[PDB]
Amino acid sequence: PPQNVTLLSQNFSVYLTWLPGLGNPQDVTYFVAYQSSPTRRRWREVEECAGTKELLCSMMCLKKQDLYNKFKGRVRTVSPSSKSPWVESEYLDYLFEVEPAPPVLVLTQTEEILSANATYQLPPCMPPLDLKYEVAFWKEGAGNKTLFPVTPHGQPVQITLQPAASEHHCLSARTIYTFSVPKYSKFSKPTCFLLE
Amino acid sequence: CHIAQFKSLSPQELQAFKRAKDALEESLLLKDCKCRSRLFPRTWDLRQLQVRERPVALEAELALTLKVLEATADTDPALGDVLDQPLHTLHHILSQLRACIQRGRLHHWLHRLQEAPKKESPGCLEASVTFNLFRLLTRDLNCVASGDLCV
Amino acid sequence: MVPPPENVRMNSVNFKNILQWESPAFAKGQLTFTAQYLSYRIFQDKCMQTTLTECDFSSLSKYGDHTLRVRAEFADEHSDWVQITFCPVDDTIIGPPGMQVEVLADSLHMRFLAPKIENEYETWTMKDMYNSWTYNVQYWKQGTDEKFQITPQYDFEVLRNLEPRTTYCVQVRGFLPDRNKAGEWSEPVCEQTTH
Ligand SMILES: *[C@@H]1O[C@H](CO)[C@@H](O)[C@H](O)[C@H]1NC(C)=O
Ligand SMILES: *[C@@H]1O[C@H](CO)[C@@H](O)[C@H](O)[C@H]1NC(C)=O
């Protein structure tokens, strides 16, 4: 049986992660199922993850899954000749434990103005969440980073640009998801180039 | 209609609802919550109903939620203090929803909602209204407040 | 009978709800004031036996109406209930947004920062509380006192076609067209455009 099984959340989605058993052979295979807090009797099995050897399974959206109540998952190692007991993870409430991903910045340089939009690869079945993005802007070689106010998702960030050209400017964006308390994300990798 | 303001609730209000939901769930651990029929679980979503029918569907669900939670609060004082602010907010939302609305799926849903209190145990009713609270406040209320935008 | 509090009002800027009253004259000694809010159907109590003439009600729900009450007590005896009604959604006073104006040659670039709510978080500002929120910008050249009004669609705006070597003063305020409610103007910031 897997030693540490964790139901974690990242990139707006939920995953179940385990590790191989200490004595488990190399031909080890894993089967995973999930249950919801409202219904403790049902233990519906994940079809896409059934028979997987990948130590990682995705439980983002499954049949008859409720993301508005906490749910848990279990995983077992199924040998070709034996089956191990199910190992259940902890309950995960999606609306309060979802880790947002950094946004994808789209840059458009209008005359004396730089517009930075944020685009998101949200899951199709994700609940409607409040997503806002803060934009840090700076010059290469200097630690002075100007941090702009949070902007709602679907609205661009307009940065005033000086007439000066042939300069190294870089941008990054951080997602702030707010349901009851703000959860921040890591700043996106700085994708930057020469302007004007 | 001034319901558009309920598209998103203040995080402080959502914190209060979370506290109430946790307290209600803890009480449910002891009570026997078995339902003759899963009335609250809704197979269809308000989106499937016409924009005009979405409010009346939510109003009936919200009225049941309020009624069951009101009784639970009166029965247990320990739940009364934590459920007070949630109940106040829910009643205000209910008043706006009613003041907003001047056979099919909707008729059966309304009949089932009306007959549920007189045929189901109070414990399972309060369990159903508890586990549907954020479903109603984040998925339904948002679509109803959104109006034509929700599709 | 000890006198009730006088001039009981609720000043609430950016949902910073504060109940204020004036302590009535009483030569017997200092008066202790208790305040309560009608939560649902029962009157819950804050600011119990508060020597101060001020109570904080910012913890109140921001949705729906509330009924507040304050009274004064000296030892066993107490005053009468002084009851007011507070509706945070519309009774609140919209504060002035922060202003960041930069002169860029012959133009002004202004960025407006939404009035923050201390009870809420930096993500939840007064822009998200009111879905119909918009910004009104009023600018004028110094001396002429001829105001010009614009309504930016977002929190950033550019004023162009400005005379060179000339100083203009600008203000910004939040507005709610669906209810015709306007916040207080920001302090006029005056900036010079040169070459
Ligand atoms: C499981 O986690 C523990 C830490 O408590 C660690 O010692 C152990 O190595 C982990 N299991 C595996 C297979 O790495
Ligand atoms: C910014 O992106 C959002 C979606 O990510 C889009 O709805 C909006 O129109 C964009 N604004 C622009 C391109 O100015």
Author numbering:
A (entry chain B): 6 to 201
B (entry chain C): 4 to 105, 115 to 163
C (entry chain A): 20 to 214
Please quote the authors directly.
When they were initially discovered, type III interferons (IFNλ1-3) were structurally and evolutionarily classified as members of the IL-10 superfamily of cytokines. Further investigation, though, revealed that they are functionally interferons (IFNs) with distinct roles in mucosal and innate immunity. While predicted to be structurally similar to IFNλ1-3, IFNλ4 shares only 28% amino acid sequence identity with its closest relative IFNλ3 and has a distinct biochemical composition resulting in IFNλ4 being one of the most positively-charged known cytokines (pI = 11.3). We next use protein engineering to overcome the affinity limitation for structural determination of the ternary IFNλ cytokine-receptor complex and determine the 72 kilodalton (kDa) structures of IFNλ4 as well as IFNλ3 in complex with IFNλR1 and an affinity-matured IL10Rβ via cryogenic electron microscopy (cryoEM).
Through extensive optimization of sample preparation, we successfully determined both ternary complexes using single-particle analysis to final resolutions of 3.26 Å for IFNλ4 and 3.00 Å for IFNλ3. B The structure of the IFNλ3 (blue) ternary complex solved in parallel with the IFNλ4 complex provides a frame of reference for differences in receptor engagement of IFNλR1 and IL10Rβ-A3. Overall, the structures of the IFNλ4:IFNλR1:IL10Rβ-A3 and IFNλ3:IFNλR1:IL10Rβ-A3 complexes are similar to the previously solved ternary complex of an engineered, high-affinity IFNλ3 (H11) with IFNλR1 and IL10Rβ27. Viewing the ligand from the front, IFNλ3 has a large acidic patch that engages with both IFNλR1 and IL10Rβ, but mostly the latter; while the acidic regions of the protein contacting IFNλR1 are mostly conserved, this same region for IFNλ4 at the IL10Rβ interface contains more basic and neutral residues. IFNλ3 and IFNλ4 make extensive contact with IFNλR1 and highlight the ability of the receptor to engage with basic residues, most notably Asp98 on IFNλR1 interacting with Arg47 of IFNλ4 and Lys21 of IFNλ3, which find themselves at similar locations and forming similar polar contacts at the interface. The importance of the hydrophobic residue network on IL10Rβ has been extensively described and consists of the Tyr59 residue in Loop 2, Tyr82 in Loop 3, and Tyr140 and Trp143 in Loop 527,36–39. These residues indeed form extensive contacts with IFNλ4 and IFNλ3, but in distinct orientations. Tyr82 engages spatially similar areas of IFNλ4 and IFNλ3 and in both cases is almost completely buried at the interface (>97%) but due to the differences in their surface charges, Tyr82 with IFNλ4 forms a hydrogen bond with the backbone nitrogen of Glu36 instead of the multiple hydrogen bonds formed with Ser11 and Ser13 on IFNλ3. Tyr59 in the IFNλ3 structure shares two hydrogen bonds with the ligand at Glu73 and Asp87, whereas there are no polar contacts shared with IFNλ4, indicating that the latter interaction is more hydrophobic in nature.
